[PDB]
């Protein structure tokens, strides 16, 4: 010729419903 | 040579491992056009057969020329889609110089 | 009465006239690779990729159309019959665009079996090929269509199965686009089943786009309940998320149709 | 032997010299026995044309008699129709312009004389819409003889019914394809039906329908009145009667001339018409029928003689009897090739065969006459060509395959020259 | 449209949690019997596997295509 | 084939049968049969054509409405013929008739003095859209094979030099003589009339008995 | 962060692993390096895309870059054409 | 010289003129 640390780089499948922060 | 990685997740890579090693989900990525959200070579699971060379269309997935990639831990050797990445930008220039060379011949 | 005795490669099979060549073929158990003919679609001829050959007779006939006679013996494995579709294969894919690796209907082609099982080796086809523009069918059907064989089984359901009439043929030659003249989405309900129902990977689905490729998925039978038709259904899983939904075929109930808001 | 006496001639008006309108005609005396040809029977009419021998005067060649017998089958409800195609696409069919606008009549009398043999409640003849100017010729002399009550109800004092209509056609060559014909005239898309339904069992309007080339409409009623005989009697065998014959291209004076059949070719071009452009020598090849038939070389025409099966022994069709002439000047590797660009604008797109086959010939014939291609290529071609013939949902695709089929059959040599030529100048 | 693989039929044991592993995101599955389906020519002889080996069964009876009636001339028809 | 609506060409631009134009559509249906109308788009997708050469997307909207059928019908009826003109035609609209019959005979010839005439390429309307030059395949009327169309006048066995004349006549003054600006009449051949130069049988000449 | 923004987060019981470890993810994303690609200008209506290289590139496709409406886009490299 | 001019509605308006001796429809 003139340490790794593994993830899973994808999204959350199932999104979860969030309560309402309003009290009722 | 852009900068747009090659693969376009058709995922037949994943279908003629023979180890299950390739693991590969996809979407549409905004541009439109069709990338692996996430691409997991088990390298321990992988038995370096050089089939995934030989399947892929746009020929993404190549066996690199490096096999000095001993590691400590267990969870170094499972690769995602960044390592390899990162492992295809360090050595292209000789990946691109051997798939030069033995073209023809495939 | 009304039973006429055919024979499929001597077989002996008896149908009642007025059933098709292929028709034949299939109670005998054989398939005639076919495209533009659907069991519940309108025979149309398109394709001949079906063209086999009755016995003693000069030409081959259109397995779909020719009402079998008395007595016609059809040879579906002859010598003729396999360079009926040795050459026509030839020609659908001659100037098909190959993007099998985008084309998501990749195992799901009933274009590429014919071809790795009826048709030839190898290509001829040295010259150029066509393109044709893609345009915009609605938010749920994505027509890559420079896909499309020009077999009108679209034009059919869009008229026969759903009362849409919209979608037609437009021009002549070897640029006759199947695609609404003026951009007007197809709105309707039984929308989904063109995906279904059209071989080529023209248009397909644009929510599972690129998500997953058909020998992944892991196919659970199960009821549509989004109706109260009760449709049946096939969920296609892929390692624990549902990716698609499609038809599964009920006589009764569904007869390989789905509708919009249950896939 | 040809030579056909003027007398004999069915077409007199041809060339007009004879006022084409009503006063003419009735000097040429075409209204002459009608009354009495009805009269005698549907079942009178056909036994004239069976005697005849009459083969289709399209590009198509069957007994007349036959096709027109299937239809004789008694009525099942729905009305039975005649329709005539006046279009012709085909080069060199300037044939049948001439009986539209030189003799209008004939064909009106012959389409009320056939109509009576299918019992056709009503005939509409559907002239190319190129010819706009034929259209005018047609129903003036329609409407002039309604106004003398020729056709009509109760048409030429007789119990039959008759009505005769125009169609416009819209500058398309598959719209003459029989079943097309029909599919324009019901205002679909012109394209071809299949075959298995004969357009007789089902058809314009879903009623039972029979097609005629115009030629084969017109000489209907002469053939009644000469008589089967003597109509028989000029032709050879299953070949019969006179068919107009067009000579188009490389000859000294083209002209479409109606002289007898089973004309030996080298005579047609010699003794009538012009000899060919540059002498009998200066010819490359003959196209007997029109663009569909194969071009046959010089080293048969003189042998030949114009028949439909003549021309079948030598692998060529009769068809429209155009004959187009190539000289010794001509570069037929580009001549054909223009034929099968004809073909490219013009097939339906229906039917796969034919749609990708004829645009594949095209671009490999467009690479010959430069002589990019290599010499194996030819015989792909060839395999091309067949694979498109007995493929087809119609008969264009079967037209399409012969002219490439003649090109490599005669003239291979030259083909592999041109191939050369390129070789050598890198 | 293929039917070859209608043909033969197939007893499948019933589908078990297929929860997301922590670490890479790969499916991950503690049911043995679930990726096996084994293939029996004829009903009779997949119902007596059943038997035999103890696993209960609910059998579903084959469903295949009504004959149907179709002719090109058909179509044409104007008046229908 | 597609029509991506543009401010000229799109049903902004109104279409509607003059009272006479209506007139011509309805005695049209009658020629064909009861109980049917669809038969008729061509006709009278032709008149929409007679009334103006553009036919717009709009126009074919009421095709479709006149005649009551699906209005993709009319659209695909449309973009089959080669007659009809989905965009804006040339007052005169001259095409050459390009087929081997012709071209053997010169058709070829003729083009490229057309072109340098009209000064414009082939395809196109001139600037003064004054003329649009086509090359059409097969008209008919191959006997007399040099040949240009000009709005059905036909013109016929022209040499290079007469369309340049006719060219001319068009573009000052009208109707130019249309037909075959040869000495041979109709199709006749150049020679003469072979085929018959007696005089013709007059009525019930030689009919055969029975 | 990553491609697909991979955000193991400040809550998730994961983001564990990275603590005195550093995590992978890539510079140059490619999202946006076609983009910053310029359009191919082509005088044909349709053009090919080996993807450059032949046997190197990749299936060779036909592009229809008929409406300057729309750069066509090779459904490989996401190279625009303009017409 | 019929045929050296007509107008572009001959076929039509002759046509319809023709209706009144065209024969009941079906
Ligand atoms: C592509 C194609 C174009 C045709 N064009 C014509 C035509 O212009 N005129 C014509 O008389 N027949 C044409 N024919 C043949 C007709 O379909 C039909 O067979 C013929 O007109 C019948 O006339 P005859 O039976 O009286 O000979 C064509 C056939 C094909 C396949
Ligand atoms: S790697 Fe090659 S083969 Fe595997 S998906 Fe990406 S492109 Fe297709
Ligand atoms: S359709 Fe899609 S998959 Fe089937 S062949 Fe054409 S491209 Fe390959
Ligand atoms: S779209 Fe699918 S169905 Fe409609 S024609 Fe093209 S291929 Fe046949
Ligand atoms: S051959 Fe097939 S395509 Fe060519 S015209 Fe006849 S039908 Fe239409
Ligand atoms: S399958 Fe034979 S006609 Fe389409
Ligand atoms: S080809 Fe020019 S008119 Fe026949
Ligand atoms: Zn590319």
Redesign the pocket.
């Known amino acids: 010729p003139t340490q790794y640390v593994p993830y899973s780089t994808t999204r959350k499948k199932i999104h979860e419903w969030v309560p309402p922060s309003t009290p009722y | 040579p852009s900068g747009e990685e090659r693969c376009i997740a058709c995922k037949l890579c994943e279908a003629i491992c023979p180890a299950q090693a390739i693991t590969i989900e996809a979407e549409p990525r905004a541009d439109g056009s069709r990338r692996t959200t996430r691409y997991d070579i088990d390298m321990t699971k992988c038995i370096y057969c050089g089939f995934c060379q030989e399947a892929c269309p746009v020929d993404a997935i190549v066996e690199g020329p490096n096999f000095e990639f001993s590691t400590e831990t267990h969870e170094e050797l499972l690769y995602n889609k960044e390592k390899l990445l990162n492992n295809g930008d360090k050595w292209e220039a000789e990946i691109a110089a051997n798939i030069q060379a033995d073209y023809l011949y495939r | 009465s009304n039973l006429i005795e055919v024979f499929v490669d001597g077989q002996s099979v008896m149908v009642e006239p007025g059933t098709t060549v292929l028709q034949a073929c299939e109670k005998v158990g054989m398939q005639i690779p076919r495209f533009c003919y659907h069991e519940r679609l309108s025979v149309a001829g398109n394709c001949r990729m079906c063209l086999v050959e009755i016995e003693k007779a000069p030409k081959v006939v259109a397995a779909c159309a020719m009402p079998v006679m008395k007595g016609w013996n059809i040879l579906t494995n002859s010598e003729k019959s396999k360079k009926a579709r040795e050459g026509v294969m030839e020609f659908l894919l001659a100037n098909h665009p190959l993007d099998c690796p985008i084309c998501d209907q990749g195992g799901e082609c009933d274009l590429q079996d014919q071809s790795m099982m009826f048709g030839s080796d190898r290509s001829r086809f040295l010259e150029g090929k066509r393109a044709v523009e893609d345009k915009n069918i609605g938010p749920l059907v994505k027509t890559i269509m420079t896909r499309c064989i020009q077999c009108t089984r679209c034009i059919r359901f869009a008229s026969e199965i759903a009362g849409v009439d919209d979608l037609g043929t437009t021009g002549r030659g070897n640029d006759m686009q199947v695609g609404t003249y003026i951009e007007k989405m197809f709105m309707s309900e039984l929308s989904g089943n063109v995906i279904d129902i059209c071989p080529v990977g023209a248009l397909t689905s644009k929510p599972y786009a690129f998500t997953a490729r058909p020998w992944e998925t892991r196919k659970t039978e199960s009821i549509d309940v989004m109706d109260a038709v009760g449709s049946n259904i096939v969920v296609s899983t892929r390692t624990g998320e549902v990716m698609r939904i499609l038809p599964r075929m009920h006589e009764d109930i569904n007869e390989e149709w789905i509708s919009d808001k249950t896939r | 032997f040809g030579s056909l006496k003027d007398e004999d001639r069915i077409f007199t008006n041809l060339y007009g010299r004879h006022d084409w309108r009503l006063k003419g005609a009735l000097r040429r005396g075409d209204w002459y026995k009608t009354k009495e040809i009805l009269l005698k029977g549907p079942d009178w009419i056909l036994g004239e044309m069976k005697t005849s021998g009459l083969r289709?005067?399209?590009?198509?060649?069957?007994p007349?008699g036959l096709?027109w017998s299937f239809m004789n089958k008694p009525s099942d409800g729905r009305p039975k129709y005649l329709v005539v195609?006046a279009?012709?696409?085909?080069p060199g069919?300037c044939k049948?312009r001439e009986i539209m606008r030189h003799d209008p009549h004939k064909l009106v009398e012959g389409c009320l004389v056939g109509g009576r043999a299918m019992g056709a409640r009503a005939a509409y003849i559907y002239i190319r819409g190129e010819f706009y100017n034929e259209a005018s010729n047609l129903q003036v002399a329609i409407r002039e003889a309604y106004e003398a009550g020729l056709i009509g109800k109760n048409a030429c004092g007789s119990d039959y019914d008759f009505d005769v209509f125009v169609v416009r056609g819209a500058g398309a060559?598959?719209c003459?394809?029989?079943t097309a014909?029909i599919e324009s005239i019901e205002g679909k898309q012109g394209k071809?039906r299949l075959k298995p339904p004969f357009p007789a069992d089902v058809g314009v309007f879903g009623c039972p329908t029979t097609?005629?080339?115009?030629e084969?409409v017109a000489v209907s009623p002469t053939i009644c009145r000469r008589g089967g005989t003597w109509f028989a009697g000029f032709g050879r065998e299953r070949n019969s009667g006179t068919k107009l014959f067009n000579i188009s291209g490389h000859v000294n004076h083209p002209c479409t001339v109606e002289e007898e059949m089973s004309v030996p070719l080298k005579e047609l071009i010699e003794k009538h018409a012009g000899g060919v452009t540059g002498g009998w020598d200066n010819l490359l090849a003959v196209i007997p029928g029109g663009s569909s038939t194969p071009l046959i070389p010089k080293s048969v025409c003189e042998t030949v003689l114009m028949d439909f099966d003549a021309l079948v022994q030598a692998q060529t069709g009769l068809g429209t009897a155009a004959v187009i002439v190539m000289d010794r000047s001509t570069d037929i590797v580009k001549a054909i090739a223009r034929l099968i660009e004809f073909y490219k604008h013009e097939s339906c797109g229906q039917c796969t065969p034919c749609r990708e086959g004829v645009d594949w010939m095209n671009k490999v014939m467009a690479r010959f006459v430069k002589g990019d291609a290599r010499p194996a290529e030819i015989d792909s071609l060839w395999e091309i060509s067949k694979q498109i013939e007995g493929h087809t949902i119609?008969?264009?695709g079967?037209?399409a395959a012969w002219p490439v089929q003649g090109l490599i059959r005669h003239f291979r040599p030259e083909l592999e020259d041109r191939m050369q030529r390129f070789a050598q100048q890198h | 449209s293929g039917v070859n693989n209608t043909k033969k039929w197939k007893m499948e044991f019933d589908t078990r949690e297929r929860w997301e592993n922590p670490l890479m995101g790969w499916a991950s599955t503690a049911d043995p019997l679930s990726n096996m389906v084994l293939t029996f020519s004829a009903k009779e002889d997949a119902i007596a596997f059943a038997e035999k080996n103890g696993w209960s069964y609910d059998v579903e009876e084959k469903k295949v295509p009504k004959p149907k009636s179709k002719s090109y001339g058909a179509n044409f028809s104007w008046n229908k | 084939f597609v029509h991506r609506d543009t401010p000229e060409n799109n049903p902004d631009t109104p279409f509607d049968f003059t009272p006479e134009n209506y007139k011509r559509i309805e005695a049209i249906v009658k020629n064909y049969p009861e109980g049917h109308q669809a038969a008729a788009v061509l006709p009278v997708l032709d008149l929409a054509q007679r009334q103006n050469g553009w036919l717009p997307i709009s126009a074919m909207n009421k095709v479709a409405e006149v005649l009551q059928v699906p209005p993709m019908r009319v659209y695909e009826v449309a973009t089959f013929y080669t007659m009809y003109n989905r965009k804006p035609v040339g007052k005169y609209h001259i095409q050459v008739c390009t087929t081997t019959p012709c071209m053997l005979r010169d058709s070829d010839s003729i083009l490229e003095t057309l072109q340098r005439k009209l000064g414009i390429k082939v395809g196109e309307t001139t600037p003064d859209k004054l003329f649009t030059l086509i090359e059409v395949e097969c008209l008919g009327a191959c006997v007399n094979a040099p040949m240009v169309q000009i709005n059905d006048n036909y013109y016929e066995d022209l040499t290079p030099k007469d369309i340049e004349e006719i060219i001319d006549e068009l573009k000052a003054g009208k109707v130019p003589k249309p037909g075959p600006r040869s000495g041979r009449f109709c199709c006749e051949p150049a020679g003469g009339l072979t085929s018959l130069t007696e005089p013709p049988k007059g009525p019930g000449f030689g009919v055969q008995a029975g | 962060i990553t491609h697909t923004g991979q955000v193991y987060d400040e809550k998730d019981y994961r983001r564990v692993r990275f603590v005195d470890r550093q995590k992978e993810v890539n510079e140059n994303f490619a999202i946006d390096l076609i983009a910053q690609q310029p359009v191919n200008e082509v005088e044909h209506r349709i053009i090919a895309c080996d993807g450059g290289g032949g046997a190197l590139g990749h299936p060779k496709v036909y592009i229809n870059l008929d409406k300057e409406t729309k750069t066509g886009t090779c459904g490989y490299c996401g190279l625009q054409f303009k017409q | 010289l019929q045929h050296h001019d007509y107008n572009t509605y001959t076929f039509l308006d002759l046509n319809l003129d023709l209706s009144k001796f065209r024969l009941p429809q079906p």
């Not at chain 4, 289709?56 to 069957?62: I, K, L, N, P, S």
């Not at chain 4, 279009?87 to 085909?90: L, P, Y």
């Open positions: 289709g005067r399209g590009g198509a060649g069957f007349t096709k195609n279009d012709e696409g085909e069919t049948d060559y598959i003459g394809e029989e014909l071809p097609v005629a080339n115009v084969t119609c008969a264009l079967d037209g």
